[PDB]
Amino acid sequence: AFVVTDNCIKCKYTDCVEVCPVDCFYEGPNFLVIHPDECIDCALCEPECPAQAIFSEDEVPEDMQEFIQLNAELAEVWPNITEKKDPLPDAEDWDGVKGKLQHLER
Numbered sequence: 001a002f003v004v005t006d007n008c009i010k011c012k013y014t015d016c017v018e019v020c021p022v023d024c025f026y027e028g029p030n031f032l033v034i035h036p037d038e039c040i041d042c043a044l045c046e047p048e049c050p051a052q053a054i055f056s057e058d059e060v061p062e063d064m065q066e067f068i069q070l071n072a073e074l075a076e077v078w079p080n081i082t083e084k085k086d087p088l089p090d091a092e093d094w095d096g097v098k099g100k101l102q103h104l105e106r
């Protein structure tokens, strides 16, 4: 699986969905996740994310490990998203701010 990590939050550019061949992204109000059983590890989404928030499971930074299970969990409850949309309105302001998990919306 690939995994969406902290920097997506309050950014949610959604560039990642457009290259995904198996449509395994799931949408929250201010974050996206990857369903780990559906992802085929094609890695195509990684360079597409302007927030640089996507990692191979086995490359998630130590300080963002909680994102692995959180993707798996939210992918069960959020709706599939398969089309790009506009980034969140103040994405640029939040791109690169650390610790945005505190802002994650369910």
Ligand code: SF4
Pocket (backbone or CB within 6 Å): 001, 002, 019, 020, 021, 022, 023, 024, 025, 034, 038, 039, 040, 041, 042, 043, 044, 045, 046
């Ligand atoms: S690695 Fe490939 S299959 Fe998995 S989420 Fe990214 S684009 Fe989709």
Ligand code: F3S
Pocket (backbone or CB within 6 Å): 004, 007, 008, 009, 011, 012, 013, 014, 015, 016, 017, 031, 032, 048, 049, 050, 051, 052, 053, 054
């Ligand atoms: S910011 Fe989030 S919505 Fe996709 S393009 Fe990056 S993982």
